[PDB]
């Protein structure tokens with residue numbers, strides 16, 4: 001019919017930074033924006049590409065906040081538009097951490113993802 005063989009993924013980076021200076025947490029989090037974009041481009045999107053129906057993700061954006069907390073909670077999100085439903089949420093989450101089922105040391109503990117739309121057209 002009009003079937004949805006794909007779902008939409010939102011990947012997130014979550015980092016806590018020291019803020020003993022008691023500065024604006026948007027400026028503290030800003031310090032690793034470039035680092036997060038480079039991570040997304042050179043590791044995260046490459047890891048997940050083999051699961052995409054038609055390649056494409058949004059620009060990484062930081063969640064804005066209003067606090068100068070002693071520890072700054074920082075969050076970035078990017079959307080991957082079209083991933084085959086063949087690949088479940090856990091399977092995709094795992095792919096962030098390990099690139100072999102017999103890998104001893106996980107990577108990217110600061111990265112997680114969700115299905116942000118459970119029904120999208122694969123376009124393929």
Ligand code: NI
Pocket residue numbers: 001002003
């Ligand atoms: Ni159809």
Ligand code: NI
Pocket residue numbers: 002003004121
């Ligand atoms: Ni539809």
Ligand code: NI
Pocket residue numbers: 021023
């Ligand atoms: Ni100061």
